[PDB]
Design a protein around this motif. Sequence first.
Motif, PDB file in Angstrom:
ATOM      1  N   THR A  41       0.897  -1.179   0.000  1.00 19.21           N
ATOM      2  CA  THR A  41       0.000   0.000   0.000  1.00 19.21           C
ATOM      3  C   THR A  41       0.923   1.214   0.000  1.00 19.21           C
ATOM      4  OG1 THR A  41      -1.770  -1.212   1.064  1.00 19.21           O
ATOM      5  CG2 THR A  41      -1.918   1.165   1.188  1.00 19.21           C
ATOM      6  N   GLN A  50       3.651   0.455   3.101  1.00 20.73           N
ATOM      7  CA  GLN A  50       3.486  -0.740   3.957  1.00 20.73           C
ATOM      8  C   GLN A  50       3.457  -1.965   3.039  1.00 20.73           C
ATOM      9  OE1 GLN A  50      -0.172  -1.060   6.127  1.00 20.73           O
ATOM     10  NE2 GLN A  50       0.872  -1.926   7.909  1.00 20.73           N
ATOM     11  N   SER A  82       0.033  -6.168   5.626  1.00 20.32           N
ATOM     12  CA  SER A  82      -0.963  -5.687   6.622  1.00 20.32           C
ATOM     13  C   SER A  82      -0.400  -5.879   8.037  1.00 20.32           C
ATOM     14  CB  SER A  82      -2.297  -6.365   6.430  1.00 20.32           C
ATOM     15  OG  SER A  82      -2.160  -7.770   6.511  1.00 20.32           O
ATOM     16  N   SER A 130      -0.916   1.964  10.666  1.00 17.71           N
ATOM     17  CA  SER A 130      -1.135   1.014   9.554  1.00 17.71           C
ATOM     18  C   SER A 130      -1.793   1.741   8.385  1.00 17.71           C
ATOM     19  CB  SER A 130      -1.974  -0.152  10.021  1.00 17.71           C
ATOM     20  OG  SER A 130      -2.050  -1.120   8.978  1.00 17.71           O
ATOM     21  N   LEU A 131      -1.618   1.225   7.180  1.00 12.98           N
ATOM     22  CA  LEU A 131      -2.323   1.718   5.966  1.00 12.98           C
ATOM     23  C   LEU A 131      -3.487   0.791   5.614  1.00 12.98           C
ATOM     24  CD1 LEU A 131       0.785   2.819   3.836  1.00 12.98           C
ATOM     25  CD2 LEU A 131      -0.469   4.031   5.638  1.00 12.98           C
ATOM     26  N   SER A 132      -3.845  -0.133   6.506  1.00 14.41           N
ATOM     27  CA  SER A 132      -4.933  -1.125   6.302  1.00 14.41           C
ATOM     28  C   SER A 132      -5.555  -1.475   7.653  1.00 14.41           C
ATOM     29  CB  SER A 132      -4.432  -2.371   5.568  1.00 14.41           C
ATOM     30  OG  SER A 132      -3.310  -2.949   6.224  1.00 14.41           O
ATOM     31  N   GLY A 133      -6.742  -2.078   7.635  1.00  9.75           N
ATOM     32  CA  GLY A 133      -7.430  -2.517   8.864  1.00  9.75           C
ATOM     33  C   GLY A 133      -8.248  -1.399   9.478  1.00  9.75           C
ATOM     34  N   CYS A 161      -6.640   2.029  10.202  1.00  8.72           N
ATOM     35  CA  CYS A 161      -5.987   2.636   9.032  1.00  8.72           C
ATOM     36  C   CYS A 161      -5.921   4.177   9.128  1.00  8.72           C
ATOM     37  CB  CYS A 161      -6.795   2.262   7.814  1.00  8.72           C
ATOM     38  SG  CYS A 161      -5.966   2.978   6.404  1.00  8.72           S
ATOM     39  N   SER A 176     -16.542   2.301   2.267  1.00  8.37           N
ATOM     40  CA  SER A 176     -15.855   1.126   2.869  1.00  8.37           C
ATOM     41  C   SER A 176     -15.601   0.055   1.810  1.00  8.37           C
ATOM     42  CB  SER A 176     -16.661   0.576   4.013  1.00  8.37           C
ATOM     43  OG  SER A 176     -17.935   0.179   3.547  1.00  8.37           O
ATOM     44  N   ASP A 203     -13.244  -2.887  -0.487  1.00  9.08           N
ATOM     45  CA  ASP A 203     -12.033  -2.970  -1.329  1.00  9.08           C
ATOM     46  C   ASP A 203     -11.933  -1.724  -2.215  1.00  9.08           C
ATOM     47  OD1 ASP A 203     -11.289  -5.413  -0.211  1.00  9.08           O
ATOM     48  OD2 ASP A 203     -12.429  -6.549  -1.727  1.00  9.08           O
TER      49      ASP A 203
END
Lengths: 153, 153
Positions: free
Chosen positions: A2, A22, A25, A105-108, A111, B107, B109
């Motif tokens: 990401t 990142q 994840s 983080s860049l995810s989750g 984010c 939200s 993907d």
Amino acid sequence: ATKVVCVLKGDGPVQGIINFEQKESNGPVKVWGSIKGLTEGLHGFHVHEFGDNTAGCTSAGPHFNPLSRKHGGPKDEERHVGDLGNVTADKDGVADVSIEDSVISLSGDHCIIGRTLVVHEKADDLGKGGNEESTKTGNAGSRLACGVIGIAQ
Amino acid sequence: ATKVVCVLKGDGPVQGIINFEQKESNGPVKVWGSIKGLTEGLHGFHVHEFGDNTAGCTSAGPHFNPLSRKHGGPKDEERHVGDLGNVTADKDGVADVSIEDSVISLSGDHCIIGRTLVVHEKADDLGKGGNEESTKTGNAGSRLACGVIGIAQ
Ligand SMILES: [Zn+2]
Ligand SMILES: [Zn+2]
């Protein structure tokens, strides 16, 4: 991977570009780029909760803190998710930034995409200033420049 | 309910604030706000792929198109995810925006959080202009103002 980017702008001369990347994840995030127009020395460097620039840097809200902890340095167990510590401006007022952080983080669900990166007026005291302001903001003072954290190519 | 906000700024006089709200992850997104400093009439209004303002609106890249489709209007079966059609500026150069779209999401993907909202120089021809440019950009022309789509309180 990401990849994300943040363009920092404010009411004054401080401007910069900060990259985040990142590879996996809840793996570490590399943060790097350059900020110019800063006074020589340490400047607090934080992810704030809201990607809301409707009232300049003020509408970004506080340091991103989804686990409801006190302010600290990036190396501390007691920190906000958004606590990336300080960046260092050289005698030409240029901060070459290069940080690795494992808490952002860049995810989750926590984010930082669509949140705000802020560079502050003063040094972040990392919670060591002996007052309630230290354990909230690190006494880093006013918001010189900010940007919303956006998806990059 | 996910709530996001976008502050539109550019080189010239066009500026605005656009809100997005989605009650459920499957559900429609309400898009509303105001843009000022526009020419009277229709202006293309699109989510572009990148939240990247490093070279102004140009670095936002093309319309957000994760399904690799051709350009359309919001009501066309063939459209980019980012294709929100036109907004209408009154004779005072103010566009009151109120759109409901069921293709964009805040939200999942294909989230638009951290991507860029752009208001364009001219009308979107909704992919029906009979040239290659129509099938990519709707011939909406230059990017007057843009912002990264950020998380709001
Ligand atoms: Zn903090
Ligand atoms: Zn399109």
